[PDB]
Design an enzyme around this catalytic site. Sequence first.
Site, PDB file in Angstrom:
ATOM      1  N   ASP A 284     -58.495  -4.742 -50.405  1.00 49.32           N
ATOM      2  CA  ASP A 284     -58.006  -3.435 -50.079  1.00 49.32           C
ATOM      3  C   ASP A 284     -57.414  -2.883 -49.472  1.00 49.32           C
ATOM      4  OD1 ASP A 284     -60.060  -0.459 -50.392  1.00 49.32           O
ATOM      5  OD2 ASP A 284     -59.328  -0.148 -48.139  1.00 49.32           O
TER       6      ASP A 284
ATOM      7  N   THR B 216     -55.169   4.134 -51.785  1.00 51.81           N
ATOM      8  CA  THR B 216     -53.899   3.724 -50.644  1.00 51.81           C
ATOM      9  C   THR B 216     -53.417   2.587 -50.783  1.00 51.81           C
ATOM     10  OG1 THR B 216     -55.306   1.310 -49.691  1.00 51.81           O
ATOM     11  CG2 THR B 216     -56.341   3.425 -48.799  1.00 51.81           C
ATOM     12  N   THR B 217     -53.949   1.460 -52.014  1.00 50.86           N
ATOM     13  CA  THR B 217     -52.875   0.786 -52.431  1.00 50.86           C
ATOM     14  C   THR B 217     -52.229   1.005 -53.346  1.00 50.86           C
ATOM     15  OG1 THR B 217     -54.283  -1.135 -52.544  1.00 50.86           O
ATOM     16  CG2 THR B 217     -52.814  -1.682 -54.531  1.00 50.86           C
TER      17      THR B 217
ATOM     18  N   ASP C  82     -65.520   1.968 -50.947  1.00 50.94           N
ATOM     19  CA  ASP C  82     -65.082   2.950 -51.863  1.00 50.94           C
ATOM     20  C   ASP C  82     -65.988   3.538 -52.603  1.00 50.94           C
ATOM     21  OD1 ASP C  82     -63.416   1.208 -50.099  1.00 50.94           O
ATOM     22  OD2 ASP C  82     -61.834   0.557 -52.006  1.00 50.94           O
TER      23      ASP C  82
HETATM   24  N1  LIG Z   1     -61.023  -2.850 -65.931  1.00 54.78           N
HETATM   25  C1  LIG Z   1     -59.905  -2.157 -65.446  1.00 54.78           C
HETATM   26  N2  LIG Z   1     -58.866  -2.018 -66.448  1.00 54.78           N
HETATM   27  C2  LIG Z   1     -57.533  -1.583 -66.149  1.00 54.78           C
HETATM   28  N3  LIG Z   1     -56.946  -0.785 -64.786  1.00 54.78           N
HETATM   29  C3  LIG Z   1     -57.851  -0.729 -64.505  1.00 54.78           C
HETATM   30  C4  LIG Z   1     -59.547  -1.692 -64.246  1.00 54.78           C
HETATM   31  N4  LIG Z   1     -59.848  -0.935 -62.809  1.00 54.78           N
HETATM   32  C5  LIG Z   1     -59.062  -0.781 -62.866  1.00 54.78           C
HETATM   33  N5  LIG Z   1     -57.956  -0.024 -62.858  1.00 54.78           N
HETATM   34  C6  LIG Z   1     -56.900   0.174 -62.612  1.00 54.78           C
HETATM   35  O1  LIG Z   1     -56.588  -0.455 -61.416  1.00 54.78           O
HETATM   36  C7  LIG Z   1     -56.128   0.483 -60.542  1.00 54.78           C
HETATM   37  C8  LIG Z   1     -56.064  -0.141 -59.227  1.00 54.78           C
HETATM   38  O2  LIG Z   1     -57.310  -0.390 -58.769  1.00 54.78           O
HETATM   39  P1  LIG Z   1     -56.951  -0.488 -56.928  1.00 54.78           P
HETATM   40  O3  LIG Z   1     -55.920  -1.201 -55.881  1.00 54.78           O
HETATM   41  O4  LIG Z   1     -58.997  -0.891 -56.279  1.00 54.78           O
HETATM   42  O5  LIG Z   1     -57.655   1.607 -56.689  1.00 54.78           O
HETATM   43  P2  LIG Z   1     -56.076   1.793 -55.485  1.00 54.78           P
HETATM   44  O6  LIG Z   1     -54.630   1.587 -56.015  1.00 54.78           O
HETATM   45  O7  LIG Z   1     -56.732   3.297 -55.420  1.00 54.78           O
HETATM   46  O8  LIG Z   1     -56.324   0.841 -53.985  1.00 54.78           O
HETATM   47  C9  LIG Z   1     -56.878   1.894 -60.132  1.00 54.78           C
HETATM   48  O9  LIG Z   1     -55.105   2.947 -61.339  1.00 54.78           O
HETATM   49  C10 LIG Z   1     -57.753   1.707 -62.216  1.00 54.78           C
HETATM   50  O10 LIG Z   1     -57.486   2.768 -62.549  1.00 54.78           O
HETATM   51 MG   LIG Z   2     -59.373   1.539 -55.871  1.00 57.57          MG
END
Ligand SMILES: Nc1ncnc2c1ncn2[C@@H]1O[C@H](COP(=O)(O)OP(=O)(O)O)[C@@H](O)[C@H]1O
Ligand SMILES: [Mg+2]
Lengths: 523, 529, 318, 525
Positions: free
Chosen positions: D58, D91-92, D392
Amino acid sequence: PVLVLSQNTKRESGRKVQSGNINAAKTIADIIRTCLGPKSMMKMLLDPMGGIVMTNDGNAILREIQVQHPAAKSMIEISRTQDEEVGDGTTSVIILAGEMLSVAEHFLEQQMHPTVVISAYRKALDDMISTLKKISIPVDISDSDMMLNIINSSITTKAISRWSSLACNIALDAVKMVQFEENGRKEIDIKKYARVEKIPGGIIEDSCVLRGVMINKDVTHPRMRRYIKNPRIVLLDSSLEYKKGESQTDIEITREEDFTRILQMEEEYIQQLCEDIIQLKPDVVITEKGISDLAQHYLMRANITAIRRVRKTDNNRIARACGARIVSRPEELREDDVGTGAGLLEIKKIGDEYFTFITDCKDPKACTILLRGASKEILSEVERNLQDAMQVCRNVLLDPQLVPGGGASEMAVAHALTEKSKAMTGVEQWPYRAVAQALEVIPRTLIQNCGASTIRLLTSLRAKHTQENCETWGVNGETGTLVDMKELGIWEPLAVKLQTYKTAVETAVLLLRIDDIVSGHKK
Amino acid sequence: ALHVPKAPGFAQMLKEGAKHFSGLEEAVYRNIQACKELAQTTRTAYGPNGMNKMVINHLEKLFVTNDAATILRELEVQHPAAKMIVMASHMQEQEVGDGTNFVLVFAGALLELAEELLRIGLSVSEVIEGYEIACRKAHEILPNLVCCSAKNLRDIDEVSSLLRTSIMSKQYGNEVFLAKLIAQACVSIFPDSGHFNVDNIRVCKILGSGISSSSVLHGMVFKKETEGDVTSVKDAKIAVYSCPFDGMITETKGTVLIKTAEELMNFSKGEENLMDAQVKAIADTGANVVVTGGKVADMALHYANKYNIMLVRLNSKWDLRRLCKTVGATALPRLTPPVLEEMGHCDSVYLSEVGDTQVVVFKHEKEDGAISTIVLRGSTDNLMDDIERAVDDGVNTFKVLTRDKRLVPGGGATEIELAKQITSYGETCPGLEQYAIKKFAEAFEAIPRALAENSGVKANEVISKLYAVHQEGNKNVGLDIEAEVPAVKDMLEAGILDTYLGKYWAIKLATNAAVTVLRVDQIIMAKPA
Amino acid sequence: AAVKTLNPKAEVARAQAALAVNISAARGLQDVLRTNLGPKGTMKMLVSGAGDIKLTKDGNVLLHEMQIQHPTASLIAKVATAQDDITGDGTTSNVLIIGELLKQADLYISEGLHPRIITEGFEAAKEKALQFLEEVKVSREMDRETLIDVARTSLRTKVHAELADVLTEAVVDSILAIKKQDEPIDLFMIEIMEMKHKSETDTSLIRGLVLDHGARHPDMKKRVEDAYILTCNVSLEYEKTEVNSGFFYKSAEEREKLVKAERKFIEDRVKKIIELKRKVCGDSDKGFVVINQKGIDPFSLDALSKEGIVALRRAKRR
Amino acid sequence: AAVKTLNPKAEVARAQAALAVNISAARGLQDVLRTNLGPKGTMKMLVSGAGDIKLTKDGNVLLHEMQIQHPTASLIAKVATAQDDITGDGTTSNVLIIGELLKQADLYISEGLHPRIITEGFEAAKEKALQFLEEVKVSREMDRETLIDVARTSLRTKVHAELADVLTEAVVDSILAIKKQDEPIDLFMIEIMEMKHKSETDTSLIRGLVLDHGARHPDMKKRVEDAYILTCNVSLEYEKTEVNSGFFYKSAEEREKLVKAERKFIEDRVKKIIELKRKVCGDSDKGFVVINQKGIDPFSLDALSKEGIVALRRAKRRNMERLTLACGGVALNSFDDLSPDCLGHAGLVYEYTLGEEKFTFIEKCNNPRSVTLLIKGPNKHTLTQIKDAVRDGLRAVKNAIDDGCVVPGAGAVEVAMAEALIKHKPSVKGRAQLGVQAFADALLIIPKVLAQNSGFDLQETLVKIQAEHSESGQLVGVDLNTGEPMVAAEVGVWDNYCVKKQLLHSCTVIATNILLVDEIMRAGM
Ligand SMILES: Nc1ncnc2c1ncn2[C@@H]1O[C@H](COP(=O)(O)OP(=O)(O)O)[C@@H](O)[C@H]1O
Ligand SMILES: [Mg+2]
Ligand SMILES: Nc1ncnc2c1ncn2[C@@H]1O[C@H](COP(=O)(O)OP(=O)(O)O)[C@@H](O)[C@H]1O
Ligand SMILES: Nc1ncnc2c1ncn2[C@@H]1O[C@H](COP(=O)(O)OP(=O)(O)O)[C@@H](O)[C@H]1O
Ligand SMILES: Nc1ncnc2c1ncn2[C@@H]1O[C@H](COP(=O)(O)OP(=O)(O)O)[C@@H](O)[C@H]1O
Ligand SMILES: [Mg+2]
Ligand SMILES: [Mg+2]
Ligand SMILES: [Mg+2]
């Protein structure tokens, strides 16, 4: 060792002291010289508390920096003075004071006496005041469009300039609601009754001024309503708990029933307080002190929602907003003290916190500006800018006279002083004309911070101001060209610019009178 | 968030104690401030009312003077731009000998006005352009401001009237005496050829009496005594040897190899007989005075006493050379008797006691020669050193007049006329160069301003009076220091004059120093070793 | 890491670290030297640890004088030093182009492109650029006007314009004087002497030589009109024998004879010079100047002055 | 400099230096957090100064746990903290887009373009991007299947795939249980209890409540079948009088009478409870469980056990509401007039001991508007990781309900918004087109990093995806298993419209303000 003064007592004197003071002051000026105008850049200050302050505000910067030179101390103090008095011009004042001291350095090196320079400066200040009041224009404060333009001309130089319309309307609404009159005394107290609550997250475009107030509170008991559409509100300074007496009220029990009777007496006391409250039939009860669980029980039985421990300031704002009167003895509670005027009490979850809204008020003499944005720092800067906007609105509503910006006022006043100096035949004509040309620093700095040619533009502008009806001509801090302020729209409050000039000239006078520094001596 | 890190790049790669300044604020303005502080340290010493300073150097040596270059040398100037202005002042001292304080004052003024122009919005390039064009105009103008010329440097009254001004700024109270002395010396050592050497004016500082007991001596003085019994000679026949007054020995190791009692018995008597022969040949050439640059042997001294020769030992080689120039002799590297041409002559050579000090005097009676000495009397060594500096100023002024005989009016008259004419030139010059031309002009006002401030009067009224009189047409009018109130008078008619070459070089060097300081934009100081 | 497990006090920058370090240092040097470029560049002042001042616009001087302790900076300083040793110009541009290649390559490497692929593209571009350079180069008859334009293009970057207009003619004439057709130019044959007395625009070209020393005998003339110059590398001072010798005498008279004899060897060379002088200058019409790479003792100086020769000693092997 | 002449111990970064400092720190944070992005991201281990272990993917947790002392890093940590407090996700991506905006702006600022012009282009691009976002958002009937796809898209990034397949149903059912139609979702009504005994896939949703305490009297039953639940906030222990009292007696007999009398006040409340119990349970068929927010002394515990009541004490002020929403009674601060309508019902109540801790399950409620997620796992760090992940996921489903719209994921919206911004660029006046281009190339950091983390060539993958989106116009993203373009709306990869909007807004704002910073200054000394 046979000393007369204690060691650590160091005494400087003379032109070294004078030049040192002038250099310290003009250094304070160079610190924030670039923070003036619409095209300024932000500065990231690091507090001793691990905090950060990202701002363009001269007083914020100078208040966050620390110095040891007493002249620099005096300059920081005059920035604070400008901020407390008018709430604007905090960097115009610093720059003008620095330039005045700079031009006085000349006359001091040329054997002129500081008192001569000071008398000339005071003559020039009176004539500046005269010239500003002659070139000022009136305002119809009932013209919301004119007022919004006045507020825009003050916040364009700040970060919120991107959300200018939003911030202007917020400030205007807040000040117009805080405008209050009682017993023949008008009062715009935008420090006690216009509240800014910064909730990080969301977007700035959803920030708003509420027709009511907002506090970070929840119901005391989750059986209490969180939504009421015509709440009758009661405010208290007293605890709805059973507290001790002021005297040594010690009890002495010998009978069996007496202990239980005493505890039941406490319960009956809480019941009687709560009945004194219920008799007025409120919907909401808000306290600055605690509320016991038995009191909560009785209020809930009466279908009353209670909020336990609110701050005195928040309670005063709730009073002004909903039309209530804070009480301290529910026995002394009256219908006139009950709060009718609030149109809705809501307690909603913003993020993972519970916020109490008392909004939809009619004729609320208090308000809460709910700021939303990316972070506490961005919202701190938005709050400071909104303080500027509201203070400018207040200064106008008090004195409706306006003067032109973009350095137009500085050039008009400099020209008028130069024209008046030709009748001067003594030796003060030189410092007098010097402060006149020292007012030119505002358009000079504006041109510098816009990135244009100071020499050429200031020459064309000084020439324009020799014509007759050209006292409104200034410069854009956004394009680097001369314009008519009647066409651009940058009009400052006469009160603001008067306070600026006065503070600058008096700071110069003070530092000129100063000589013979002494130090070390311990209180 | 409680620390600002060094930015990536040069700020991080910089060494530990090194400093880097860049831009108008950190470099240009700080350099101008340093040069301004320097000019302020030396401003109060400018002119006849200029005050002395008591500088103590790192060696605890004391200097009491109002000579700008001396003060600068004995100060520990550590700011590089100030060092550059000091280099300009020392170059002025080298080229001309007087005008170092002009160089400092003018450079500081140009730099202060340059800072003001940069603040109003001119660029260093435009400031430099205007300063250079205005220096060119000043050099074009000065020849027209030349008022008088020397017309004779073999006289003693005219030369005194000419040197008085340069030796007035230093030693204001007593300048007629000093100008008389320095004129006598300069015209004594002035040859029929137009070349004049300042090292041929010697200065002997002897403790005792005071500046009015100082004198000129057509000859030489050495704070020495005589090696032998003879102390006076009235028709000197001086013989000068760079070799010792001893028997010559081999440059390769010499050994006295004895193998017989007879050789052993006769060696030393043979040595003395050799010495007697050598010194008797010298005495029979007519020499009554011998001057050796090396040591003297006891036997040779014995025989010089026997044959009535005054023996003098001059440790220094510059002293030996100057004595040869004085007497018309030739330093012989061998102890061979001198030929009629290798010999030197003096109307008298004697040992005297000036004060506590014993001195050997080679004195000509004629009012000429190749070398002259000024014997400075005084109650303090510091006072005598200051008077020697004033003597140096007078002698360097004489040399400047031998090079170029032209003179400009002093007391700020030429500076005011320059300021006026260059202002009139800047008022015609269009473009952004006019600002810099006008500031270069206004910088000249710093000279009469410094003179007035030190005189003890209001510089603004003095400068206004000067501008008014030079507008009415009088270019030789400057300020009167002999007036408690602001006043002005004809510098020419008063006899207060400067050297055209002095002003030329001072203006050129001050302008060059200011322009270099301005041309600097970044500074990368190293860790002070 | 691996190296730090064996040498605990070891410093290491990895593939992303190493690249960041090197590119950061290169861009820092580039940021400093960007201002040197061109005649409108700015002069930097450099103060040694002793307080000595240097005013420079030259990239190599600035590099070596800055106070830097970076490995990449050392690499680039050395490449610039080679540029200066071989060509005399190009150090600022060298540093700038190095920094810009590194930056433009980082532009693609940060998006995951491999530096090997960037360097392959570098090789292709180097080839094509060298071809285009040979194509656009102007083969020109090197006349004084062309050489003046070249020397101006360099001196106007290094100094002020009026001083450049002086140094241009000085440099061009000096080279056009010591150059023999189709014979590599020996710049050693252009001496460079500094005098610290007059203005900087007095810098001139003497169509001859200026030695930083003069005669050490005062009776020697200070000006000679039609002079025979004798360039020698022969000692005219007292020389002791290689094998240890020593003098042995039994009387002051013998000592005197040995003192007169020990100098006969150098007196003979002095006489050879003097006889040549007399044979070439039968009178005082012409002059005779001896310039010795070695010493001349006072006795020899006197002997030559008496015959009217101006002798300078300890000249330079060049 | 100026500030250093007045405060000698002052630190200052000037116009070139402050921008370099800020952009360098932003890119450093970006370099650290680049690997968190997506389900193929890598888990970082974080060890406190005490030795405690955190396993996280996270961005916000990683930020707050890294050991950093940089001002720009503090700014970006705070913007990310606001993102997390309001949306729960982003956040990432927030940190990555901030870093990429700063980098793409430095690309033009190093060539002498002014940051003011870059920020003007940023404002234009923000406007157009928000428009395009509202345009591409999918307004969808929030069915269990859609909510499952959303919660999967979040939990698969935060934890392993099988554990994500468990937490997905858990989170979706919990929210679909505590949610009332057109009534903002109070996530407080989903308790989150951690148990440290079993596997991580035992994490379940209890359709009731789990209190982290149990009965303190041993004779009290450990299992109750048909239970009347009394939610109270009434002290059942000895209460001393507010005013100082004291007891005075002349004999041991009087002392004994006073000892018996001093408890009558609380005995009366115990009797009120016991009489209600007898009236509602005339026999031992049903059960009676008292849950007190306050204390219960041993005498009261004995009195209630003797009558067959299970009494838990010192419950949570939130459990008062959670119990009245799960069971269905009324929480009381007084027993003045208590009636059977004040009671709730739970079809089962029992106790669970785990080492030294006890748990109380309250299940088989009728239609509980409050539930609990029991986070089971073998390690404290596993439990913490699942807590973060379920936070989340809960925020994600809540946001999908609030915003009846849902946005395609896998960098699809970023690809499409970049193309739209580049097609919009000519309508922008001046060199703010460069700020627009920088905004677009910054938006493209999400698909780039997704490819980088799946192990693909960023440029090749991005060219393929952009080509497919230009030829077809369909919203396509990165397939993290093949590197090919895929329709995120068709494969069920969803993002939160609120999260994307908050990203655009806050990232643009903070990047603009950082670019416009021209002096960093520590001078408070
Ligand atoms: N199965 C998947 N295939 C492709 N992309 C995905 C999948 N699951 C999540 N993502 C994308 O990966 C990105 C980053 O996820 P994450 O790091 O948890 O989000 P955040 O940046 O909000 O912390 C998101 O934009 C999401 O749309
Ligand atoms: Mg996420
Ligand atoms: N659009 C504009 N063009 C030119 N000048 C402006 C403009 N807006 C404001 N100003 C001028 O900028 C100054 C205010 O700048 P600001 O940074 O707010 O400093 P302060 O309020 O501390 O004096 C005033 O002189 C105002 O007239
Ligand atoms: N009697 C005098 N009246 C007015 N000015 C004088 C007089 N004597 C000298 N001066 C002035 O003093 C200045 C030189 O003083 P000095 O301190 O020696 O400076 P510098 O070192 O530049 O020669 C010149 O301007 C000269 O004209
Ligand atoms: N008058 C001029 N006008 C335009 N460009 C010039 C001029 N003079 C020199 N240049 C160019 O400026 C560049 C840099 O000069 P300089 O810094 O001295 O060279 P280097 O990079 O070799 O140190 C050279 O490429 C040169 O061609
Ligand atoms: Mg303002
Ligand atoms: Mg003098
Ligand atoms: Mg070059």
